[PDB]
Write a protein that binds this ligand. Sequence first.
Ligand SMILES: [Zn+2]
Lengths: 171, 406, 49, 46, 240, 121, 126
Amino acid sequence: YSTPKRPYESSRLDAELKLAGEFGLKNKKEIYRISFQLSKIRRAARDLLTRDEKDPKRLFEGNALIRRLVRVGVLSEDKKKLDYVLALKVEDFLERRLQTQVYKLGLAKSVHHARVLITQRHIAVGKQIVNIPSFMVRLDSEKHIDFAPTSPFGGARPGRVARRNAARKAE
Amino acid sequence: GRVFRYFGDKLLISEAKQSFTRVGENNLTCISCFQPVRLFAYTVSKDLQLTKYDITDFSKRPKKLKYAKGGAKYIPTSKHEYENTTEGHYDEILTVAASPDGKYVVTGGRDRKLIVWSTESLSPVKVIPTKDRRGEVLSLAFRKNSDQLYASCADFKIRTYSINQFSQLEILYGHHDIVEDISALAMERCVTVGARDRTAMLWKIPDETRLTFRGGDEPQKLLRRWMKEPLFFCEGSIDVVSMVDDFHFITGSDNGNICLWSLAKKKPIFTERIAHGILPEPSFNDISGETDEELRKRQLQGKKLLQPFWITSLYAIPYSNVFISGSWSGSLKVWKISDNLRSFELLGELSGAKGVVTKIQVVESGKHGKEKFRILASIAKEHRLGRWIANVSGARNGIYSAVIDQ
Amino acid sequence: SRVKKRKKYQKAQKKLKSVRAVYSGGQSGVYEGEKTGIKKGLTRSVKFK
Amino acid sequence: KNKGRISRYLANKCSMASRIDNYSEEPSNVFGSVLKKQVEQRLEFY
Amino acid sequence: GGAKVVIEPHRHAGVYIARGKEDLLVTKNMAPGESVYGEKRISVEEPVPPTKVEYRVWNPFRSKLAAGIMGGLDELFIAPGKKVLYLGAASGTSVSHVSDVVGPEGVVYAVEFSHRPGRELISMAKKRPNIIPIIEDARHPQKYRMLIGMVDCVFADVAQPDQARIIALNSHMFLKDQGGVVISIKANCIDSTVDAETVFAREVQKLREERIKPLEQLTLEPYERDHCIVVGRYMRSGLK
Amino acid sequence: NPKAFPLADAALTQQILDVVQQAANLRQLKKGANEATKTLNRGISEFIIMAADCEPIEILLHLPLLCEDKNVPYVFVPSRVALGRACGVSRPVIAASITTNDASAIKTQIYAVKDKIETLL
Amino acid sequence: QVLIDTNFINFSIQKKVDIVRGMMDCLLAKCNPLITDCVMAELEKLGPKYRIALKLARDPRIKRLSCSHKGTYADDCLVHRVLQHKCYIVATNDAGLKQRIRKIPGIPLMSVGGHAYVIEKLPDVF
RNA sequence: CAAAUUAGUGACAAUAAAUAACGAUACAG
RNA sequence: UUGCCGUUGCUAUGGC
Ligand SMILES: [Zn+2]
């Protein structure tokens, strides 16, 4: 990642305040990392617009870029134009992470409940338990985010607090 | 294995001995059969009963042998998803599957269980729950000449089992709606179809990889293709499969399509748009509520709300040249696939099955050049998943057996 | 570091109700009334030029 | 009870009948007949 | 629910405030003794004996104009003797309140295009005689140019993307010079690809291009997300 | 013009039914006619789907007047059976409603379907 | 959408930056540049020394607004129409207009600095 | 102010996580 | 040939 140009202006501070509060982020490094690679993405798409129609670079790298952006999921299926890559922005990228997605699918009650579910390993996309919150789920892994079968919020055996309370109430 | 049984035009069609043995079970749901290398069959219903039949008395109707009826007694005393280890079904058994060797039948439904019953006594030998809340099983298929079961569960999941070891092999993920149907042959490949994502996937199960096949018919380009000189349109939901051989399969859709797909082409090779007709439009005495026939006819909008029958059962005889389609048009259809394997074509109809066809499969007899088969088809008056079905037009809950010859 | 930004964003969006008027989600139940007063002298609308 | 929920059955059938009757332009009687048959079947079931 | 309030005249003529422990925007009732959309009423006994006259609570979550009034608009042009051309009289919800603000000596022309709302408009305009219901498309003012003459304010609660053209056509036909133009702009129904401030700026630019000088805009935010009322006057010569 | 006028063609119908199924999974769908009119007069609804072939038609034609009053898009799907099957319940439904939610993972899809049926309407 | 004024155009031509391409590689987004009629009046009043600047402002890619007031004071017009609406970027190089615009909140400010455009109060530039 | 090597010691803050999540009740203005 | 019930056949159908 890389720090911004003027990192301490008040619009940037209220921006990062709204982003970290609305998406449950821990520090500025999440925003700065995802915005750095978004800057690379649309700095490339700017050059793909500054070259002309029927350029080989524009044709092939343009449909390649919009198809892998659609498959990451930040771009919808119908807007297959290259100016929407310029209209893309940072919260379109961090709505795709797993903490945001767990909360939006409703397995958690807030983004903080989603973050602690993910870091306590109750969430598995597909086959594998994912355990970091900033995961960038894709458009095919969007619908298999569910509770892990190794976890008491799935169907598994209940954890140590529940079983110790059950044992002490059996005593 | 390619298509080595080229016999589509060979056998007779129009004079089958069709016996519709009506049974007293509300909404039969599945049919499982068996042949060694006496033949038994299995049915199961929405009334929570499994029923064993003998079928080997080929020239006459099948014979009831044994009930196995779950009920409200089998509701677990926990409501907890991993102590679901009871011995009977308390809700909506959807699918049966007989073993290729015939020691067991294995069944399951909306009670998210797999109960494996012995054949000789219809007794529950083992219970395997699917360990989560939405884990309702919707289709079961053994791979042929084996002891390995492929169940398709509504968690967008496909579970695999070894039945004689009472073990689960592999859970494999990747559909996008509920995996409404499954199909397998002797290879360790499998072919599943999820309902509304309009894709059929086939799974290399040891590699745990897949090939996806989407649909993609559009009424814009299709009506332009007809406009170069017409009631046909897009697609609702791919519903049923059967793997014909190890390079091709066939899919039954929600808009009455039957499609033929290869292992080497994403888009389908062949379509057949209307396969069982379009439904009778709702009557003018049951659409509007006005007095005059002119306004009650204006409330039909012409042809805009005629909906096609959807194929709710499809069965390809393995490696053969002929498959059978069934819905609530009353008449099963028999189609043969051409020898160049790029098209199929309607041979004939089997018109003695009034109701929804919740299952089709065939039973073989005769030698390499002279053959006769009995086509079993479970007939209900209600779709095998939800109700949704009005205008029950003379239906009965039975087993439509047909005896086809030559 | 996470709980601090959880609780300085809750403070910020409680201060935002003071400066603007925030769309809370529409009419909850029966329309009870304005619950806080109606000023007939104040006009909080942006005049042009 | 049964007497308490026949009121609810008759309520939602009566709302259905009033919708038919208002938004049809020159109404018939046949759907009021069918809903009367339905509610008498429901009360005779109890 | 059975409580007692004090009625007090607002700054705006023809509308009132009922102070209790929650105060209500309130209008006089032109058809006393019934409610039109289920709002609550207030019956005062004003002093032959005193007569029971009554008042109707204007609900800001069911009226963009009441949301504008109690957010604070410096000048409505809907006044107690005027003629208002209501465009998009989608039912009799706000047209009844505009009608009895305008009073018995003024006229509200309620233009609506759909037909079941038109049937309810005619049955409401029976008991409110100062409503002329006009069932016609506002995109063609010539189709009802014979029924309306020389209005004083236009109110536009249409929710179509060709809003500014509809407002301009109806104003050029029937509005008089330095008359009122009250617009309820819904950003999402104009277009949703741009933000709300972009579409409000474009609509205000369209109004001054059709020579309606905007005086005032209000976002009306606690009652509607991404709405606006723009109050302008029809200048007709010299926005400068 | 019939009574059930703004009917959708087949591509729009399948787009509508796919987002109906996803909202039903995400608990954002209120299904049935009187639940739909309840959520419509409450104001938590983004668009209403009526099926244009139930056994009366005025039984759900009461809802376009409500949608017109509150400026909500309404669209007619030509199959109550397919609408119930998309809703995920074991019966045909004749009307359904997409409730508003901003912690909703399908908001872009719902907004795209709203734009399509509003340019239709 | 970016409101231009006269010294921004003059500094663009003095630094050899294209208007729409300089805006695009400054913001990495698609820009719509707007010349108000008062900015255009000011460029025309600048005389026949500034013919190059006037007929570079006459560009079909640069859209143009219609201000409705007397006089041609572009700083007043830009300040009023930006504090009315808050959907505008202001591209300017006047020190006084830069101080006005960066004192009113929520308004990003663009300016020719060095050999390309810079942007300050827009918090999403990378 | 990193004298140990004869798979291990001998970091250059470079790297993704945590230091809590969800409820109930009471009392204030 | 079945949960009832009807025609039944001395086997096929049709209403819930
Ligand atoms: Zn100007």
